[PDB]
Design a protein around this ligand. Structure first.
Ligand SMILES: [K+]
Ligand SMILES: [K+]
Ligand SMILES: [K+]
Ligand SMILES: [Mg+2]
Ligand SMILES: [Mg+2]
Ligand SMILES: [Mg+2]
Ligand SMILES: [Mg+2]
Ligand SMILES: [Mg+2]
Ligand SMILES: [Mg+2]
Ligand SMILES: [Mg+2]
Ligand SMILES: [Mg+2]
Ligand SMILES: [Mg+2]
Ligand SMILES: [Mg+2]
Ligand SMILES: [Mg+2]
Ligand SMILES: [Mg+2]
Ligand SMILES: [Mg+2]
Ligand SMILES: [Mg+2]
Lengths: 61, 102, 66, 91
RNA sequence: GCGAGGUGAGAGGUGCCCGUACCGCAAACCGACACAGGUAGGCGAGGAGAGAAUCCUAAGGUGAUCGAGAGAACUCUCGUU
RNA sequence: AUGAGUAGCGAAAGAGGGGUGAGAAUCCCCUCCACCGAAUGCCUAAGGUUUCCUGAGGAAGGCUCGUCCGCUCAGGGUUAGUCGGGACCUAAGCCGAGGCCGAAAGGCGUAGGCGAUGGACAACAGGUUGAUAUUCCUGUACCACCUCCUCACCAUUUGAGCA
RNA sequence: GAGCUGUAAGCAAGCUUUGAUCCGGAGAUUUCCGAAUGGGGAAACCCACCACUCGUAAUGGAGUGGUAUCCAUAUCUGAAUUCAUAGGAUAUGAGAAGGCAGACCCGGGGAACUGAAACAUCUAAGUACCCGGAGGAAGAGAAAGCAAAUGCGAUUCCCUGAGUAGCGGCGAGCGAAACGGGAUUAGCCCAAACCAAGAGGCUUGCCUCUUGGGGUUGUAGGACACUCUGUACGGAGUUACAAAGGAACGAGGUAGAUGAAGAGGUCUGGAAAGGCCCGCCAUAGGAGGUAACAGCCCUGUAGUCAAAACUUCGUUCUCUCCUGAGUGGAUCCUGAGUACGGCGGAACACGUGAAAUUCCGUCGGAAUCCGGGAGGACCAUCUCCCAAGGCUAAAUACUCCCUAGUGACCGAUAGUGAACCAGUACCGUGAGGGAAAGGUGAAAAGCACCCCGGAAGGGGAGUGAAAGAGAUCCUGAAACCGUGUGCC
């Protein structure tokens, strides 16, 4: 799924709000990005959120 | 039951109240017994393969076990029943006198 | 055959008795079908004898593997 | 498995009696026995020589006793033909 | 590729499980019914005939699960004026 | 209950003579007549699931009756190497190891499978029961496989043969 | 401890004091389907491979065991590609799978009818429902807390605060918390500084990772220095604070045992347990049954006992584990893409509002002890705490089930849909919907025999207290259907 393998950031639900305050359901996506990282010490390319990449601890291969 | 096949009991209730007789058969599931000479019924039997003539038979009918009491060996009066261990074997004792029945 | 007697035999001896009882049961079922069997009570007794013997055989197998 | 688990009981009917003149014996057999098993069992048990075994399955019959209704057990009937030069079965 | 034993013929032998009854243009299936309905496919004879049309018949099947009278009005289905 | 002993009793040719029986327009047999006959015949699906055959019964069911029945009660009846299906093949479609995708549940999909309505595939004639028949019996065949055997031929490391 | 072979009559054949049937504990067996798992499949069926075994000359046949996927562990190989890695093979696994108790719990998603007398903000409602994770409980929890006192001292739940403060097309409505009174109580463990060991990058006297020690807090604590002290004398513990194991004993659960006192006399009656006249027992006058209503007839009850085996709890012992005080303010440590902020939403009783506090997506982004957070915008002062790590029992919620019981609960149109062979019959392609139907008698003593009839059904005769109790068999109302006739 569109869930960050490292931080777990995934889609979350909430409301959209019009000016008249009408509420309708919507989701917030994680900013997931295809990157090569170590998965069990074996470099696989998986989806990681930009935020998890921001640090730099998540090293690309 | 407090009585068993073979015991001489007195009938304490019913038309045959006061009559003594031997238990010919016990029916523990129904709490009824068969007492010699008590509760005679007239069965209207049809001719069958076993009995070709049929006829109206006189026959003992079971009575409820709570309508009979065993007799005391000493006095010959009715007694309630108790139990004691004797030689590593439980036996019925006549509560009135104390003596063993069987 | 009560269980105590069954246990005194060896496994080889018991399985033979099973075969003998199977012969008895087989003949009894044939007699019943033809209406030539009087003592119907024998069938159930033989079945329980076979069960009894199989129970003792299996008991020994279990004590062996343990 | 033992031969005597395969054969259940003989079938004793006008039809089976007729077949016993042609040296064919009708048996009820275990519902899982194939006709090869039937052939082997008859030889072992009765000490005869089997020419061929024909076999058929019978459905349960619908049956009623008062308000209660149910099915009879399904059966498997084997007709065992002996060879011309074989000993007959004794029953 | 596999391979020291092979190929062909004859003789002998082995060949398991499931279905198999009966209805199936029907009183047995689908229509609540022993219901003027519906139900794929194979065979489907003779005379006249182009013909599986039509009429009368063969093989074969069937006489239809309320009847006996009467022969009014009227209704339905027909015939002639 | 009333409507009411009213509507209806669901397309159609029956008649008589015997029989059975407590009882017969209605069941059985006989005779003649009548109807279908590109079907109202024969076979065989899907489906039903014992309704099939024999004997007995007449409560209920059967639009009447009933001695009768596809009904009730007892028994009995379905036989395959060759027919149809599986130990053969695949179509549409379905499922799907890993895999791809998706808030979750799940969706999609590769290899590989399943899946006839199709492809492949060896038995015919006659006889026989109240009830089964390319199945049982008689006769004469065929297909695959196996070798305690027999014969013929070939070949034993470019060595027949299998594939 | 004397009969038994179920309902369930019947016939048949048998078993049992050499102890059956029956009751309880622990075992064995446990076809096929089902997560179903050797493969397939239209659940309960079909077809295989590998070892071993039965059988045949052999084929064909049979029995037992193994053979799903994923995950974990070990071993062997290792592509494109050189080393490698992916991948593949073998072995090892009481690893997972599925179900449910229609309940309770925590989350992911999440309505509409309806209310507002219309309706969109709002309400219904974070409800119904779907999904995931679970546990016997779950969640929360050992102060970056509540407060504003000569303060309190984890969390949870009950009372109260209070329908208050507030929120709100300030409409309909929504609606706290703290203090106070209670139930229950319980506290702990890491990360970092530092020490020791070991290893790889040599980044080259530095660094990272890995082990053990050390250490856990706020008018500061710890490291580090100083002393004092223990190293088990003594303390704790498998419910947190490390983690398994074994005994002895006690009290229970899962069958049972024993257990007082009237056939008292007499009266009706088919039958006394009732009436009348007398007794007696009672730690037992609960209850059911027995031919009408029984403390003294039966099973029982009060009371006192009982366990080969299995199981629950408790207490001791064994066993296991374990130092904690004071003085320093040189230096060092005290949880970073974190706290927090903008933007977009959500949760807080609180609808963006003056909006503190908490959570999510996206982007930006601190201080780090001379430090940091909160006290409802925000600043200053003061007061109280020390976040960005984890664990933690009890009080609480619920009941499908087990045991024992209770009811100014129902009594067959009631009470469960279901007192009865009911989730059945029947209806539906299916999901699904869904009934009707209790009573002979004390005892079958269930009407021998005779008469009419083919039978059904009757009339006698018998049984019974009663057959006007004869199988839809207690009582038997009204509608409705008849027969006879006093008046018209
Ligand atoms: K009594
Ligand atoms: K023609
Ligand atoms: K009633
Ligand atoms: Mg067959
Ligand atoms: Mg046929
Ligand atoms: Mg004219
Ligand atoms: Mg009229
Ligand atoms: Mg008609
Ligand atoms: Mg017929
Ligand atoms: Mg009729
Ligand atoms: Mg086909
Ligand atoms: Mg409204
Ligand atoms: Mg007692
Ligand atoms: Mg007593
Ligand atoms: Mg009475
Ligand atoms: Mg009811
Ligand atoms: Mg009564």
């Amino acid at each position: 799924a569109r869930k960050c393998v490292i931080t777990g950031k995934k889609t979350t639900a909430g409301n959209n709000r019009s000016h008249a305050m009408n509420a309708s359901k919507r989701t917030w996506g994680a900013n997931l990005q295809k990157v090569r990282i170590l998965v069990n010490g074996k470099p696989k390319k998986v989806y990681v959120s930009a935020r998890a990449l921001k640090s730099g601890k998540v090293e690309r291969v | 039951m407090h009585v068993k096949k073979g015991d001489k009991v007195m009938v304490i209730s019913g038309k045959d109240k006061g009559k003594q007789g031997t238990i010919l058969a016990a029916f523990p599931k129904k709490d009824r017994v068969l007492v010699e000479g008590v509760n005679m019924v007239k069965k209207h039997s049809k001719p069958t393969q076993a009995n070709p003539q049929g006829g109206i038979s006189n026959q003992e009918a079971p009575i409820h076990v709570s309508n009979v009491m065993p007799l005391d060996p000493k006095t010959g009066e009715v007694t309630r029943v108790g139990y004691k261990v004797e030689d590593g074997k439980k036996v019925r004792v006549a509560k009135k006198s104390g003596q063993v029945l069987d | 055959m009560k269980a105590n007697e069954i246990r005194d035999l060896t496994t080889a001896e018991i399985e033979q008795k099973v075969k003998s009882l199977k012969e008895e049961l087989f003949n009894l079922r044939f007699q019943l079908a033809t209406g030539q069997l009087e003592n119907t009570a024998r069938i159930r007794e033989v079945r329980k004898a076979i069960a009894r013997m199989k129970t003792v055989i299996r008991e020994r197998e279990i004590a062996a593997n343990k | 498995k033992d031969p005597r688990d395969v054969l259940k009981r003989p079938v004793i009917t006008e039809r089976s009696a007729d077949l016993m003149t042609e040296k064919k014996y009708t048996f009820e057999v275990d519902v899982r026995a194939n006709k090869t098993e039937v052939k082997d069992a008859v030889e072992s048990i009765f000490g005869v020589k089997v020419d061929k075994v024909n076999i058929m399955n019978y459905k349960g019959k619908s049956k009623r006793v008062g308000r209660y209704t149910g099915m009879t057990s399904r059966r498997r009937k084997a007709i065992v033909k002996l060879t011309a030069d074989s000993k007959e079965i004794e029953i």
